[PDB]
């Protein structure tokens, strides 16, 4: 309808101009091909000229080569534009996609948004370009064919050129009728498919009550309804083209009957009627396809509207102002109420968890209460509804978001690795500011240089997708070195199962826990020997604060520590 | 390929034969159309015999009417086969689909299986039937047009007929080239899209670890690769058509060159060469689809293979022989080793849990420790790996699953309904064996009389989806009535909500009490009132019975009763 992706086309318009020129010249090539007929039939195969037949094979092969060359060039130079705007659209949408908060990736999954990166973006320039190609080529072919009509036979030129828009209208209303009946009937077909959907929704409560025999009879009736619906749908679909063919055949018969009159006859040669008839037959495909121009132009821009709404949404709120260099001081929580997104149930009560500087605070929960939820707030993934976290004696909403996530470091076994090299991965987003020797020695105090050696190249190898495939413990052995290099003010550690690295990876996490000896540690781990070693322990459950003290002090009302 | 759908299509053969005759007539409704050209020019616009031009409009309009009528009749009569071979496939893949264990409905989704009901089965009748509407029409049009050429010109028909398979082979090899390069470049493009997916996947990592400028640079250099890849794919797809057009145009020029190479040529009238060249270009469309038909026949049979493997799998192991009536003997778990299917972690240890007859046995599993998974053993939703459930003093393996599951009435607030009437829903699968008065009073002792009377037509009211739409507890109020109509020796009671929204009903729990007046009732619940009422209590966590006793006795040791 009304699209403002044209600025993204605005510098890339030379490709459009070249494609349009090549396409109108393709239409002219088709016109000249059809123009070839009259000398062949009138001069060539009528009067035995014998030179016409000599030089026509050459020009027809030349014109077919001209059709081929111009079609290939037009397709290449329109897909150049459809690639150079899809690339720009992908770049912009990707930027605003990584801009937006984590809630956007949730409730949508990482598979759909990829389709909105490649599927929707392709349709943006595979239905608009697919509309421009038609409206130019087959829209100017009609003009060329009517110029043929004016040139070679003016007598019936008037009759078919006045008749043609009426035929276009006929095809338009027939297509509209087909579209309407198909739409309403397709809604009905879905409305009966939901019956099968419900029937297969419970395979339970059919085996229990023992109703297999009854549950096929009803499905037999539903299948019969579906069959009748499908037969009516095909009838409606395959009556459309026949009636169109009949109304256009009335035009063909009208032209031929008009030719009966003496005045139009005897001025037109045997070849002239030939070219006008064959051209009229050729007119059907452009005349039919021009009507569906708006259809395809509203199947590419329609998806583009959804893509724009994805683009035009709001990035995460960044009213923060105070960049914090290093948050070594105490971190305090203050009457913070958080609600998980998409749910009215708050997963967090009014929580006051205070993290002492350089100390350990450990959360032990197997219920899935939200130990990860509280881990989210300190990194400001999901924001805070009411209350405040005095981060080194200052609110998060005062702190800039980039600075805040520069302070914190989240270590886990679900760590994702980019398609980079190992050296650029350890010093991620700061490899310019961190040296190679720093990365190496950081890996060394992170006691993780072993597997780094054991692959092909070592200090400069790829850590890419479908490449080395480090185990979860080994990926965490990269992750600990990341925060070790970065000198994170806060190191909120997670944990999962480990075998043959419980001896290693955890006692190496002593080396990250040397940064616990140097910095705070909001450890989220759920089972380890270090859990009892943890200085301060909280056992927060169902989003509720439960108990505060060391494990021996915590053993009082404790009934879950046993594991 | 090798398909045994023909047993399914055999009774629907007359429709197929009529469709074949109709498509043959449709193809012959092009050869006569082109046949009328010769007198229209040779006897018409050449030697001016007006009478030929007088009758020509009538015959062309009649022939187009014949084309339309026969095409519509063929489309109908190839939908009475495509509407009754898809129907039998749907029905026969329905009985053997709902007879399979619920592990099918795990490891899968209802939407996917519905797609295997509607879309996948529609391909079987729209690609394997699309290989019959196409091959017999466009294979008959070829024969008709060659017979035309032979009739009107014995001389250049031989040059066109031997030449035609060469052009067909050219089309086939070009299509194979396109297919190969397209599949390869599309696989590489997929290899790029998984990179895009991984960068989208680690959203949290890019947010937390630092800036996103390097991430945008990465996506710039991956979108450049995507754009170049797409341009090359389009280059292949575009250059497919011109080379075909050229290798056919050289045949066109060959025909025209041979149209005067010997002196015996040029004995053909203008109308005749017109007919032959119109039929030559006509040949392109059938000859460009007869080669492509095998792809459609292997795109409909391929999905039929998916349907066949879904159908041909196995239903429950039905080795039991005896039918217990009312299970007055106690149900009893004895040294049963069960594991959640799809996982190696055993959700059940070796559990010995006798259920005293006519006695309530409640269990509290708010840890999420597969309490519902214990509700599945007696119903045999997931089969027991090893060990015997000592049913009624005997083993359940000796009992028929259809009969055994009738001896269990599973009652839950997530109960599934149908598109039937509320009476039959009260007596589902057994409405013939239970009268309307029995249903009426059964609902009354269930305290379901009030609402079902407040609906449209009392007990005659339809309970269909998007109809009356009883609420959750109100939906429970029907399942309980289903259980009161006997068919309920054993009552594994779900009670998932335990949410007294409007105090529930005053007699929801009282209706269950009337249900639990006698009979084994292995109660699943979170309602502390029912646990207080419960006689035997087995609290379960992490797939093991931690305790057995009564309310105070079990309160004394451990206890999550604090909730
Ligand atoms: C006045 C204004 C208003 C009044 C109007 C009233 C009208 C009166 C009614 C009468 C006419 C109505 C038509 C009718 O009544 O019936 C038609 C029946 C045809 C004959 C019956 C009646 C004719 C006589 C009537 C009068 C009798 C007195 C329709 C039909 O036959 O079938 C229809 C058919 N049309 C023809 O066949 C006529 C065909 C052929 C007809 C020939 C006979 C006609 C003339 C006879 C008389 C001549 C003198 C009078 O050519 C034409 O059109 C016109 C050709 C004439 C011009 C030159 C003739 C040569 C003779 C010269 C004198 C001797 C149509 O073809 C498709 C087009 O494709 C190429 O384009 P490309 O460029 O490749 O991209 C061709 N390029 C070409 O051919 C170019 C030529 O090769 C060049 C030749 C190459 C060398 C020659 C080879 C020979 C060698 C072989 C020997 C081995 C086109 O040709 C064109 O237009 C271009 C045109 O040729 C250019 C002219 C060049 C010709 C050269 C001149 C001669 C040279 C000689 C020397 C000088 C060709 O038309 O496909 C439809 C459906 O197919 C669909 C499908 O099923 O969905 C639809 C499309 O897909 C779409 C969609 O749109 O929905 C879009 C896709 O993107 C995709 O999304 C897809 C999706 O996947 C889902 O589907 O959906 C499509 O794509 C296709 C595709 O294949 C898919 O796979 O699939 C069919 O419908 P359906 O079957 O009914 O359902």
PDB file of N, CA, C and O in Angstrom, chain A residues 41 45 50 64 87 91 100 105 198-200 203 207-209 215 218 220 223 235 238 249 256 260 405 416 419-420 428 465 482 486, chain B residues 50 53 61 64 72 75 87 91 98 100 105 195 198 200 203 207-209 218 220 223 249 260 262 266 273-274 405 416 419 428:
ATOM      1  N   UNK A  41       4.643 -15.048 -43.632  1.00  0.00           N
ATOM      2  CA  UNK A  41       3.403 -15.571 -44.193  1.00  0.00           C
ATOM      3  C   UNK A  41       2.953 -14.826 -45.441  1.00  0.00           C
ATOM      4  O   UNK A  41       2.472 -15.457 -46.389  1.00  0.00           O
ATOM      5  N   UNK A  45       6.124 -17.204 -47.324  1.00  0.00           N
ATOM      6  CA  UNK A  45       5.507 -18.479 -47.676  1.00  0.00           C
ATOM      7  C   UNK A  45       4.253 -18.311 -48.524  1.00  0.00           C
ATOM      8  O   UNK A  45       3.565 -19.301 -48.789  1.00  0.00           O
ATOM      9  N   UNK A  50      11.752 -16.504 -51.301  1.00  0.00           N
ATOM     10  CA  UNK A  50      12.905 -17.371 -51.059  1.00  0.00           C
ATOM     11  C   UNK A  50      14.107 -16.636 -50.464  1.00  0.00           C
ATOM     12  O   UNK A  50      15.090 -17.280 -50.088  1.00  0.00           O
ATOM     13  N   UNK A  64      15.892 -14.197 -30.290  1.00  0.00           N
ATOM     14  CA  UNK A  64      15.806 -15.081 -29.135  1.00  0.00           C
ATOM     15  C   UNK A  64      17.035 -14.935 -28.248  1.00  0.00           C
ATOM     16  O   UNK A  64      16.927 -14.966 -27.016  1.00  0.00           O
ATOM     17  N   UNK A  87      19.996  -6.929   2.249  1.00  0.00           N
ATOM     18  CA  UNK A  87      21.152  -6.847   3.136  1.00  0.00           C
ATOM     19  C   UNK A  87      21.021  -5.668   4.090  1.00  0.00           C
ATOM     20  O   UNK A  87      21.276  -5.804   5.292  1.00  0.00           O
ATOM     21  N   UNK A  91      20.564  -5.859   8.105  1.00  0.00           N
ATOM     22  CA  UNK A  91      21.467  -5.178   9.029  1.00  0.00           C
ATOM     23  C   UNK A  91      20.688  -4.334  10.029  1.00  0.00           C
ATOM     24  O   UNK A  91      20.924  -4.407  11.242  1.00  0.00           O
ATOM     25  N   UNK A 100      16.935  -4.936  21.423  1.00  0.00           N
ATOM     26  CA  UNK A 100      15.731  -5.024  22.229  1.00  0.00           C
ATOM     27  C   UNK A 100      15.963  -5.926  23.444  1.00  0.00           C
ATOM     28  O   UNK A 100      16.891  -6.739  23.451  1.00  0.00           O
ATOM     29  N   UNK A 105      13.130 -11.936  22.818  1.00  0.00           N
ATOM     30  CA  UNK A 105      13.587 -13.283  22.381  1.00  0.00           C
ATOM     31  C   UNK A 105      12.710 -14.364  23.022  1.00  0.00           C
ATOM     32  O   UNK A 105      12.406 -15.358  22.336  1.00  0.00           O
ATOM     33  N   UNK A 198      -9.174 -31.242  17.998  1.00  0.00           N
ATOM     34  CA  UNK A 198      -9.624 -31.545  19.350  1.00  0.00           C
ATOM     35  C   UNK A 198      -9.615 -33.048  19.573  1.00  0.00           C
ATOM     36  O   UNK A 198      -9.182 -33.526  20.626  1.00  0.00           O
ATOM     37  N   UNK A 199     -10.030 -33.808  18.557  1.00  0.00           N
ATOM     38  CA  UNK A 199     -10.111 -35.257  18.691  1.00  0.00           C
ATOM     39  C   UNK A 199      -8.750 -35.854  18.997  1.00  0.00           C
ATOM     40  O   UNK A 199      -8.624 -36.725  19.865  1.00  0.00           O
ATOM     41  N   UNK A 200      -7.721 -35.392  18.297  1.00  0.00           N
ATOM     42  CA  UNK A 200      -6.359 -35.821  18.573  1.00  0.00           C
ATOM     43  C   UNK A 200      -5.718 -35.033  19.709  1.00  0.00           C
ATOM     44  O   UNK A 200      -4.590 -35.345  20.095  1.00  0.00           O
ATOM     45  N   UNK A 203      -5.798 -37.957  23.082  1.00  0.00           N
ATOM     46  CA  UNK A 203      -5.670 -39.408  23.066  1.00  0.00           C
ATOM     47  C   UNK A 203      -5.887 -39.947  24.470  1.00  0.00           C
ATOM     48  O   UNK A 203      -6.284 -41.105  24.648  1.00  0.00           O
ATOM     49  N   UNK A 207      -8.845 -43.630  25.637  1.00  0.00           N
ATOM     50  CA  UNK A 207      -8.418 -44.954  26.074  1.00  0.00           C
ATOM     51  C   UNK A 207      -8.928 -45.270  27.473  1.00  0.00           C
ATOM     52  O   UNK A 207      -9.060 -46.440  27.844  1.00  0.00           O
ATOM     53  N   UNK A 208      -9.239 -44.240  28.261  1.00  0.00           N
ATOM     54  CA  UNK A 208      -9.674 -44.473  29.636  1.00  0.00           C
ATOM     55  C   UNK A 208     -11.130 -44.911  29.653  1.00  0.00           C
ATOM     56  O   UNK A 208     -11.486 -45.934  30.250  1.00  0.00           O
ATOM     57  N   UNK A 209     -11.997 -44.134  29.001  1.00  0.00           N
ATOM     58  CA  UNK A 209     -13.415 -44.466  28.948  1.00  0.00           C
ATOM     59  C   UNK A 209     -13.717 -45.551  27.921  1.00  0.00           C
ATOM     60  O   UNK A 209     -14.843 -46.056  27.891  1.00  0.00           O
ATOM     61  N   UNK A 215     -15.286 -43.099  18.458  1.00  0.00           N
ATOM     62  CA  UNK A 215     -14.482 -41.945  18.083  1.00  0.00           C
ATOM     63  C   UNK A 215     -14.034 -41.998  16.626  1.00  0.00           C
ATOM     64  O   UNK A 215     -13.539 -40.993  16.107  1.00  0.00           O
ATOM     65  N   UNK A 218     -17.633 -40.599  14.487  1.00  0.00           N
ATOM     66  CA  UNK A 218     -17.681 -39.148  14.418  1.00  0.00           C
ATOM     67  C   UNK A 218     -16.596 -38.612  13.493  1.00  0.00           C
ATOM     68  O   UNK A 218     -16.842 -37.685  12.714  1.00  0.00           O
ATOM     69  N   UNK A 220     -15.437 -40.244  11.006  1.00  0.00           N
ATOM     70  CA  UNK A 220     -15.889 -40.571   9.657  1.00  0.00           C
ATOM     71  C   UNK A 220     -16.811 -39.484   9.123  1.00  0.00           C
ATOM     72  O   UNK A 220     -16.683 -39.060   7.967  1.00  0.00           O
ATOM     73  N   UNK A 223     -14.676 -36.484   8.306  1.00  0.00           N
ATOM     74  CA  UNK A 223     -13.947 -36.686   7.062  1.00  0.00           C
ATOM     75  C   UNK A 223     -14.861 -36.527   5.857  1.00  0.00           C
ATOM     76  O   UNK A 223     -14.445 -35.990   4.828  1.00  0.00           O
ATOM     77  N   UNK A 235     -14.244 -27.420  -7.306  1.00  0.00           N
ATOM     78  CA  UNK A 235     -15.242 -26.892  -8.228  1.00  0.00           C
ATOM     79  C   UNK A 235     -15.110 -25.381  -8.377  1.00  0.00           C
ATOM     80  O   UNK A 235     -15.032 -24.857  -9.495  1.00  0.00           O
ATOM     81  N   UNK A 238     -11.682 -24.477 -10.170  1.00  0.00           N
ATOM     82  CA  UNK A 238     -11.545 -24.899 -11.556  1.00  0.00           C
ATOM     83  C   UNK A 238     -12.718 -24.479 -12.431  1.00  0.00           C
ATOM     84  O   UNK A 238     -12.745 -24.851 -13.607  1.00  0.00           O
ATOM     85  N   UNK A 249     -12.745 -16.160 -25.257  1.00  0.00           N
ATOM     86  CA  UNK A 249     -13.033 -16.820 -26.520  1.00  0.00           C
ATOM     87  C   UNK A 249     -14.145 -16.094 -27.256  1.00  0.00           C
ATOM     88  O   UNK A 249     -14.181 -16.081 -28.490  1.00  0.00           O
ATOM     89  N   UNK A 256     -12.841 -12.407 -35.067  1.00  0.00           N
ATOM     90  CA  UNK A 256     -12.922 -13.164 -36.310  1.00  0.00           C
ATOM     91  C   UNK A 256     -14.191 -12.829 -37.087  1.00  0.00           C
ATOM     92  O   UNK A 256     -14.143 -12.642 -38.307  1.00  0.00           O
ATOM     93  N   UNK A 260     -15.166 -10.665 -40.939  1.00  0.00           N
ATOM     94  CA  UNK A 260     -16.027 -11.079 -42.044  1.00  0.00           C
ATOM     95  C   UNK A 260     -16.412  -9.911 -42.945  1.00  0.00           C
ATOM     96  O   UNK A 260     -16.651 -10.109 -44.141  1.00  0.00           O
ATOM     97  N   UNK A 405      26.282  -3.877  33.010  1.00  0.00           N
ATOM     98  CA  UNK A 405      26.682  -5.189  32.519  1.00  0.00           C
ATOM     99  C   UNK A 405      28.179  -5.289  32.268  1.00  0.00           C
ATOM    100  O   UNK A 405      28.685  -6.405  32.110  1.00  0.00           O
ATOM    101  N   UNK A 416      27.363 -19.637  25.454  1.00  0.00           N
ATOM    102  CA  UNK A 416      27.380 -19.741  23.975  1.00  0.00           C
ATOM    103  C   UNK A 416      28.678 -19.139  23.438  1.00  0.00           C
ATOM    104  O   UNK A 416      29.101 -18.087  23.958  1.00  0.00           O
ATOM    105  N   UNK A 419      31.260 -17.513  16.393  1.00  0.00           N
ATOM    106  CA  UNK A 419      32.037 -18.117  15.308  1.00  0.00           C
ATOM    107  C   UNK A 419      33.332 -17.350  15.037  1.00  0.00           C
ATOM    108  O   UNK A 419      33.653 -17.001  13.902  1.00  0.00           O
ATOM    109  N   UNK A 420      34.103 -17.123  16.095  1.00  0.00           N
ATOM    110  CA  UNK A 420      35.294 -16.287  16.084  1.00  0.00           C
ATOM    111  C   UNK A 420      36.534 -17.157  16.268  1.00  0.00           C
ATOM    112  O   UNK A 420      36.468 -18.389  16.229  1.00  0.00           O
ATOM    113  N   UNK A 428      36.385 -10.650  24.383  1.00  0.00           N
ATOM    114  CA  UNK A 428      35.238 -10.297  23.553  1.00  0.00           C
ATOM    115  C   UNK A 428      34.808  -8.845  23.705  1.00  0.00           C
ATOM    116  O   UNK A 428      34.631  -8.352  24.822  1.00  0.00           O
ATOM    117  N   UNK A 465      31.574 -22.499  14.984  1.00  0.00           N
ATOM    118  CA  UNK A 465      30.437 -23.406  14.949  1.00  0.00           C
ATOM    119  C   UNK A 465      30.797 -24.689  14.210  1.00  0.00           C
ATOM    120  O   UNK A 465      31.469 -24.662  13.175  1.00  0.00           O
ATOM    121  N   UNK A 482      37.105 -15.597  30.648  1.00  0.00           N
ATOM    122  CA  UNK A 482      36.558 -14.321  30.181  1.00  0.00           C
ATOM    123  C   UNK A 482      36.482 -13.301  31.315  1.00  0.00           C
ATOM    124  O   UNK A 482      37.112 -12.234  31.254  1.00  0.00           O
ATOM    125  N   UNK A 486      38.599  -9.861  32.260  1.00  0.00           N
ATOM    126  CA  UNK A 486      37.885  -8.593  32.328  1.00  0.00           C
ATOM    127  C   UNK A 486      37.971  -7.907  33.685  1.00  0.00           C
ATOM    128  O   UNK A 486      37.668  -6.712  33.768  1.00  0.00           O
TER     129      UNK A 486
ATOM    130  N   UNK B  50     -16.011 -16.458 -48.122  1.00  0.00           N
ATOM    131  CA  UNK B  50     -16.516 -15.880 -46.879  1.00  0.00           C
ATOM    132  C   UNK B  50     -17.107 -16.940 -45.959  1.00  0.00           C
ATOM    133  O   UNK B  50     -17.087 -16.779 -44.735  1.00  0.00           O
ATOM    134  N   UNK B  53     -15.013 -18.226 -43.020  1.00  0.00           N
ATOM    135  CA  UNK B  53     -14.935 -17.262 -41.933  1.00  0.00           C
ATOM    136  C   UNK B  53     -16.286 -17.122 -41.242  1.00  0.00           C
ATOM    137  O   UNK B  53     -16.354 -16.745 -40.069  1.00  0.00           O
ATOM    138  N   UNK B  61     -15.957 -21.069 -30.810  1.00  0.00           N
ATOM    139  CA  UNK B  61     -16.646 -20.880 -29.535  1.00  0.00           C
ATOM    140  C   UNK B  61     -17.157 -22.215 -29.006  1.00  0.00           C
ATOM    141  O   UNK B  61     -17.093 -22.482 -27.800  1.00  0.00           O
ATOM    142  N   UNK B  64     -14.120 -24.062 -27.600  1.00  0.00           N
ATOM    143  CA  UNK B  64     -13.741 -23.516 -26.301  1.00  0.00           C
ATOM    144  C   UNK B  64     -14.737 -23.925 -25.224  1.00  0.00           C
ATOM    145  O   UNK B  64     -14.350 -24.176 -24.078  1.00  0.00           O
ATOM    146  N   UNK B  72     -13.693 -28.683 -16.577  1.00  0.00           N
ATOM    147  CA  UNK B  72     -14.408 -28.617 -15.307  1.00  0.00           C
ATOM    148  C   UNK B  72     -14.868 -30.001 -14.865  1.00  0.00           C
ATOM    149  O   UNK B  72     -14.775 -30.345 -13.680  1.00  0.00           O
ATOM    150  N   UNK B  75     -11.854 -31.832 -13.601  1.00  0.00           N
ATOM    151  CA  UNK B  75     -11.439 -31.325 -12.302  1.00  0.00           C
ATOM    152  C   UNK B  75     -12.359 -31.839 -11.202  1.00  0.00           C
ATOM    153  O   UNK B  75     -11.904 -32.160 -10.100  1.00  0.00           O
ATOM    154  N   UNK B  87      -9.711 -39.292   1.720  1.00  0.00           N
ATOM    155  CA  UNK B  87     -10.601 -39.561   2.844  1.00  0.00           C
ATOM    156  C   UNK B  87     -10.272 -40.902   3.485  1.00  0.00           C
ATOM    157  O   UNK B  87     -10.178 -41.007   4.715  1.00  0.00           O
ATOM    158  N   UNK B  91      -8.925 -41.581   7.305  1.00  0.00           N
ATOM    159  CA  UNK B  91      -9.619 -42.424   8.272  1.00  0.00           C
ATOM    160  C   UNK B  91      -8.740 -43.582   8.728  1.00  0.00           C
ATOM    161  O   UNK B  91      -8.656 -43.867   9.928  1.00  0.00           O
ATOM    162  N   UNK B  98      -4.697 -43.116  16.841  1.00  0.00           N
ATOM    163  CA  UNK B  98      -5.231 -42.972  18.184  1.00  0.00           C
ATOM    164  C   UNK B  98      -5.121 -44.282  18.960  1.00  0.00           C
ATOM    165  O   UNK B  98      -5.285 -44.306  20.179  1.00  0.00           O
ATOM    166  N   UNK B 100      -2.266 -45.844  19.074  1.00  0.00           N
ATOM    167  CA  UNK B 100      -0.878 -45.945  19.488  1.00  0.00           C
ATOM    168  C   UNK B 100      -0.694 -45.303  20.861  1.00  0.00           C
ATOM    169  O   UNK B 100      -1.514 -44.483  21.280  1.00  0.00           O
ATOM    170  N   UNK B 105       1.997 -38.855  21.404  1.00  0.00           N
ATOM    171  CA  UNK B 105       1.548 -37.481  21.608  1.00  0.00           C
ATOM    172  C   UNK B 105       2.496 -36.718  22.522  1.00  0.00           C
ATOM    173  O   UNK B 105       2.467 -35.484  22.564  1.00  0.00           O
ATOM    174  N   UNK B 195      24.559 -19.955  11.259  1.00  0.00           N
ATOM    175  CA  UNK B 195      25.408 -18.948  11.888  1.00  0.00           C
ATOM    176  C   UNK B 195      24.579 -17.767  12.374  1.00  0.00           C
ATOM    177  O   UNK B 195      24.748 -17.296  13.509  1.00  0.00           O
ATOM    178  N   UNK B 198      22.832 -18.846  15.493  1.00  0.00           N
ATOM    179  CA  UNK B 198      23.643 -18.916  16.705  1.00  0.00           C
ATOM    180  C   UNK B 198      23.916 -17.524  17.257  1.00  0.00           C
ATOM    181  O   UNK B 198      23.895 -17.321  18.476  1.00  0.00           O
ATOM    182  N   UNK B 200      21.922 -15.001  16.959  1.00  0.00           N
ATOM    183  CA  UNK B 200      20.673 -14.621  17.616  1.00  0.00           C
ATOM    184  C   UNK B 200      20.487 -15.372  18.931  1.00  0.00           C
ATOM    185  O   UNK B 200      19.865 -14.856  19.866  1.00  0.00           O
ATOM    186  N   UNK B 203      21.835 -14.212  22.833  1.00  0.00           N
ATOM    187  CA  UNK B 203      21.495 -12.815  23.058  1.00  0.00           C
ATOM    188  C   UNK B 203      22.042 -12.347  24.396  1.00  0.00           C
ATOM    189  O   UNK B 203      22.631 -11.265  24.498  1.00  0.00           O
ATOM    190  N   UNK B 207      24.662  -9.276  25.217  1.00  0.00           N
ATOM    191  CA  UNK B 207      24.227  -8.181  26.081  1.00  0.00           C
ATOM    192  C   UNK B 207      25.174  -7.991  27.255  1.00  0.00           C
ATOM    193  O   UNK B 207      25.556  -6.859  27.576  1.00  0.00           O
ATOM    194  N   UNK B 208      25.571  -9.080  27.901  1.00  0.00           N
ATOM    195  CA  UNK B 208      26.292  -8.957  29.161  1.00  0.00           C
ATOM    196  C   UNK B 208      27.786  -8.740  28.933  1.00  0.00           C
ATOM    197  O   UNK B 208      28.409  -7.961  29.660  1.00  0.00           O
ATOM    198  N   UNK B 209      28.382  -9.413  27.948  1.00  0.00           N
ATOM    199  CA  UNK B 209      29.837  -9.440  27.870  1.00  0.00           C
ATOM    200  C   UNK B 209      30.404  -8.100  27.423  1.00  0.00           C
ATOM    201  O   UNK B 209      31.580  -7.815  27.668  1.00  0.00           O
ATOM    202  N   UNK B 218      30.153  -8.536  12.583  1.00  0.00           N
ATOM    203  CA  UNK B 218      29.992  -9.944  12.244  1.00  0.00           C
ATOM    204  C   UNK B 218      28.780 -10.154  11.351  1.00  0.00           C
ATOM    205  O   UNK B 218      28.843 -10.892  10.360  1.00  0.00           O
ATOM    206  N   UNK B 220      27.343  -7.918   9.463  1.00  0.00           N
ATOM    207  CA  UNK B 220      27.603  -7.305   8.167  1.00  0.00           C
ATOM    208  C   UNK B 220      28.341  -8.278   7.261  1.00  0.00           C
ATOM    209  O   UNK B 220      27.935  -8.519   6.115  1.00  0.00           O
ATOM    210  N   UNK B 223      25.923 -11.197   6.339  1.00  0.00           N
ATOM    211  CA  UNK B 223      24.867 -10.824   5.409  1.00  0.00           C
ATOM    212  C   UNK B 223      25.435 -10.558   4.025  1.00  0.00           C
ATOM    213  O   UNK B 223      24.746 -10.760   3.024  1.00  0.00           O
ATOM    214  N   UNK B 249      14.933 -22.489 -29.684  1.00  0.00           N
ATOM    215  CA  UNK B 249      14.854 -21.536 -30.778  1.00  0.00           C
ATOM    216  C   UNK B 249      15.709 -21.991 -31.950  1.00  0.00           C
ATOM    217  O   UNK B 249      15.366 -21.744 -33.111  1.00  0.00           O
ATOM    218  N   UNK B 260      12.805 -24.315 -46.726  1.00  0.00           N
ATOM    219  CA  UNK B 260      13.149 -23.990 -48.107  1.00  0.00           C
ATOM    220  C   UNK B 260      14.431 -24.644 -48.603  1.00  0.00           C
ATOM    221  O   UNK B 260      14.811 -24.388 -49.750  1.00  0.00           O
ATOM    222  N   UNK B 262      15.262 -27.817 -49.659  1.00  0.00           N
ATOM    223  CA  UNK B 262      15.050 -28.452 -50.965  1.00  0.00           C
ATOM    224  C   UNK B 262      14.009 -27.705 -51.783  1.00  0.00           C
ATOM    225  O   UNK B 262      13.275 -26.871 -51.244  1.00  0.00           O
ATOM    226  N   UNK B 266       8.256 -25.558 -49.807  1.00  0.00           N
ATOM    227  CA  UNK B 266       7.415 -24.451 -50.258  1.00  0.00           C
ATOM    228  C   UNK B 266       6.201 -24.933 -51.054  1.00  0.00           C
ATOM    229  O   UNK B 266       5.526 -24.129 -51.707  1.00  0.00           O
ATOM    230  N   UNK B 273       1.685 -23.967 -42.876  1.00  0.00           N
ATOM    231  CA  UNK B 273       2.867 -23.596 -42.105  1.00  0.00           C
ATOM    232  C   UNK B 273       2.452 -22.827 -40.864  1.00  0.00           C
ATOM    233  O   UNK B 273       3.083 -22.947 -39.811  1.00  0.00           O
ATOM    234  N   UNK B 274       1.390 -22.023 -40.962  1.00  0.00           N
ATOM    235  CA  UNK B 274       0.884 -21.347 -39.774  1.00  0.00           C
ATOM    236  C   UNK B 274       0.462 -22.342 -38.707  1.00  0.00           C
ATOM    237  O   UNK B 274       0.795 -22.178 -37.526  1.00  0.00           O
ATOM    238  N   UNK B 405      -8.557 -50.371  31.399  1.00  0.00           N
ATOM    239  CA  UNK B 405      -8.724 -48.930  31.493  1.00  0.00           C
ATOM    240  C   UNK B 405     -10.168 -48.529  31.748  1.00  0.00           C
ATOM    241  O   UNK B 405     -10.405 -47.428  32.257  1.00  0.00           O
ATOM    242  N   UNK B 416     -10.957 -33.404  28.958  1.00  0.00           N
ATOM    243  CA  UNK B 416     -11.230 -33.147  27.551  1.00  0.00           C
ATOM    244  C   UNK B 416     -12.685 -33.467  27.228  1.00  0.00           C
ATOM    245  O   UNK B 416     -13.234 -34.460  27.715  1.00  0.00           O
ATOM    246  N   UNK B 419     -17.416 -32.846  20.611  1.00  0.00           N
ATOM    247  CA  UNK B 419     -18.428 -32.085  19.883  1.00  0.00           C
ATOM    248  C   UNK B 419     -19.783 -32.788  19.929  1.00  0.00           C
ATOM    249  O   UNK B 419     -20.622 -32.590  19.046  1.00  0.00           O
ATOM    250  N   UNK B 428     -20.100 -41.247  27.681  1.00  0.00           N
ATOM    251  CA  UNK B 428     -19.310 -41.388  26.465  1.00  0.00           C
ATOM    252  C   UNK B 428     -18.822 -42.816  26.295  1.00  0.00           C
ATOM    253  O   UNK B 428     -18.329 -43.436  27.240  1.00  0.00           O
TER     254      UNK B 428
END
